[PDB]
């Protein structure tokens, strides 16, 4: 009696998933990178490790990060000596910080995105929350539903322990949710806090130490939907095609474990080398079908894992130096905010394009690419189209 | 130049997401319920707690579980006294078990589902992995890709720390992935291991103790896709509509935290009561649009959190006793395997329907419902259509 084909046709959306709003937020405590070595070696009781401090100073000087925003403060660290040691039982204390801070910072970013969107929050049908800092049941998706006053029947997707490529992951997921469901409006929130990874220095663990020079806190929120209401909603970028892959010869490049001592970061291979060796294949998969071969003719968003990934990709492809400008600006002002970074870069790019009177939100260009890099070695690819003005 | 509408039309699927294969697996160690109180009170050094053992015996007697399969054995527990205590630092030992066992068990279920499906594992485009048992980076999704030899470009969705309603969640997610992407074939794996939640008994924490009578291990895998190739692929169930909601007046009903002592299960409200009070609303949302109001006229799959949820739902709606038969058979043979449970119940239902020559895979009925229940209080609803024969 009942027609499923009629239901399916009536249930789905028509057009491409579109980013309709972007909002960001960071902890209030601003930490300058120029004075970080001294602050970090003092608060971790490591001032006597002069040679290790010199190695950390070089890591900070090479980071291309001017400052980072941190939930952790001198006061909080003085109350948590176990967090200041390289390896002490401290997950409960860290979890108590991030179970609250992740949704707190996420709400700030989400309220800003909802304000830009300008539509009733009761029209948000799906919620994607992504974090690599802490886990809990009910999760941060339930907390944000409560904190934002979303409908109780919002459809939630709680992405925990994702890693640095997950800015691409949440876009890949939001695309399918928006495109398959007529009327769907997806609130996407990436919120990353370094309280679960902060730890003291160890001269036999230099891989762990590099994380201390790079990771910073931040949240970004998006509204994503298909079939925008003309002259009411305002498209910023459209998603057109996505991919995720595991690079060959990359096993163990980035291994991150959640233990009693918190989240521990282990590095085993040349990440910049692997990314730059495999980025061209990811570009031809994405762009050959569109007839695009000139990689300077598209706008660029790349996860700034570190500056060497950016430099090596730029050199490999012969990208003009300006291609990575928005990416490098976010790295310089905020450091590596894990999954949230690429969403901050989208916001920077569209705001600079607008401010500077370019013709599209993607630096005056039509087509663009967003890349996420992280554990596995995983590469996420999202092909974007800009919007006029 | 490039038409995004053309791309979008060529990129999406046409028909409803369909379950094309189901495979399950459990650890080899079979644990009888009749004698579990003695086993559990001996291994946890609690044999002198006579009254508490009595309370546990009653929980096991009322559980309606005959046996469970568990990775944990007497030998593994004797080597891990911190896991045998009610509350001792033990997450590292538990993670070392589950980071391996979750993908191992998932692999066995996935291989079974792929064998039934019959098509090359190179045609699997998307992979959803769900567990409430441990977390790691790269996740269990990466581990399964490697273990099964899936393509490196399989698109992965790692659902960690989800909870007992996530059998519904993975179906809700797989539906959009399959329907929005032409040719997509989604391998869905739920794999749950009780090594992160096992702990000793405490007479002031009877809510934790209830979990020790109910939780068991298991993995279930599905192949989901739209547009099945007729007579090559074999549809089992179709998904038609989904929902997720948070029941009113249920805050804190089920809070589960991942701490240095592992995963701790708490209960603060009457779950059977909340579920039975809110199930009608969930049914009307799903079935009023289809013109169905007789809930005995549809086939049923309910997460068997405990037998009281089933009994109270049955009594509330006046379901005939036979409606919950497949659900109760899975509870009897395997216990509560968290997210995997509802997928085992789909398997039992279609296998008994096919074995017994009923007219459809849903007990000879056309329309059916699958419910997941868990933290938040969250209710997941999936509306299914059976397949002839």
What would CATH call the architecture of the largest domain in chain A? 3-Layer(aba) Sandwich
What do we call the CATH topology of the largest domain in chain A? Answer: Peroxisomal Thiolase, Chain A, domain 1
Spatial strand arrangement across the major sheet of chain A:
5-4-6-7-1-8-13-12-11
Determine the CATH superfamily of the largest domain in chain A. Answer: Thiolase/Chalcone synthase
Active site (chains A, B): 164 (acyl-thioester intermediate)
Pathway (chains A, B): Secondary metabolite biosynthesis; flavonoid biosynthesis
Subunit structure (chains A, B): Homodimer.
EC number (chains A, B): 2.3.1.74
Structural features, described:
Two copies of one chain form a homodimer. Chain A is an alpha+beta fold and 389 residues long. Chain A folds into two domains: 2-235, Peroxisomal Thiolase, Chain A, domain 1 (3-Layer(aba) Sandwich), CATH 3.40.47.10; 236-388, Thiolase/Chalcone synthase (Peroxisomal Thiolase, Chain A, domain 1), CATH 3.40.47.10. The first copy, chain A, contains 13 helices and 13 strands. The first copy, chain A, has helices at residues 4-11, 36-43, 50-62, 74-78, 81-84, 91-117, 140-148, 166-180, 206-214, 271-287, 307-317, 325-334, 341-355; strands at 18-25, 30-32, 67-69, 126-131, 155-160, 185-192, 218-225, 237-246, 254-259, 262-267, 299-302, 367-374, 378-386. In chain A, the strands form three sheets. A nine-stranded mixed beta sheet of chain A has the order 5-4-6-7-1-8-13-12-11, with helices on both faces. A two-stranded antiparallel sheet of chain A has the order 2-3. In chain A, strands 9-10 form a two-stranded antiparallel sheet. In chain A, α12 (325-334) crosses α13 (341-355). Chain A is globular, with a radius of gyration of 21 Å. At the A-B interface, α1, α6, β5, α8 and β8 of A face α1, α6, β5, α8 and β8 of B.
């Amino acid at each position: 009696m009942v027609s499923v084909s009629e239901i399916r046709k009536a249930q789905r959306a028509e057009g491409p998933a579109t980013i309709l709003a972007i909002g960001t937020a960071n902890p209030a405590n601003c930490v300058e990178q120029s004075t970080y070595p001294d602050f970090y070696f003092k608060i971790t009781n490591s001032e006597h490790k002069t040679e290790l401090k010199e190695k950390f100073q070089r890591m900070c000087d090479k980071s291309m990060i001017k400052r980072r925003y941190m939930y952790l403060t001198e006061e909080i660290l003085k109350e948590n000596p176990n967090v200041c040691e390289y390896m002490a039982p401290s997950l409960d204390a860290r979890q108590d910080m991030v179970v609250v801070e992740v949704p707190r910072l996420g709400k700030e970013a989400a309220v800003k995105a909802i304000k830009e969107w300008g539509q009733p929050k009761s029209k948000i049908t799906h919620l994607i929350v992504c974090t690599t800092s802490g886990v809990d049941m009910p999760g941060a998706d339930y907390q944000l539903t409560k904190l934002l006053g979303l409908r109780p029947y919002v459809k939630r997707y709680m992405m925990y322990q994702q890693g640095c490529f997950a800015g691409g992951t949440v876009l890949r997921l939001a695309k399918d949710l928006a495109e398959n469901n007529k009327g769907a409006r997806v609130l996407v929130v990436c919120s990353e806090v370094t309280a679960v990874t902060f730890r003291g220095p160890s001269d036999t663990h230099l891989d762990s130490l590099v994380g201390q020079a790079l990771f910073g806190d931040g949240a970004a929120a998006l509204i994503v939907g298909s079939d925008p209401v003309p002259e009411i909603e305002k498209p910023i970028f459209e998603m057109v095609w996505t991919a995720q892959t595991i690079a060959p010869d990359s096993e163990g490049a980035i291994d991150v474990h959640l233990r009693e001592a918190g989240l521990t970061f282990h590095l085993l291979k040349d990440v910049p080398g692997i990314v730059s060796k495999n980025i061209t294949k990811a570009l031809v998969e994405a762009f050959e079908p569109l007839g695009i071969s000139d990689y300077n003719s598209i706008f660029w968003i790349a996860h700034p894992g570190g500056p060497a990934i950016l430099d090596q990709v730029e050199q490999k492809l012969a990208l003009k130096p300006e291609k990575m400008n928005a990416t490098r600006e976010v790295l310089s002002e905020y450091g590596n905010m894990s999954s949230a970074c690429v969403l901050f870069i989208l916001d920077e790019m569209r705001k600079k394009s607008t401010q500077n009177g370019l013709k599209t939100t993607g630096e005056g260009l039509e087509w663009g690419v967003l890349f996420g890099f992280g554990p596995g070695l995983t590469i996420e690819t999202v092909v974007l189209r800009s919007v006029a003005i």
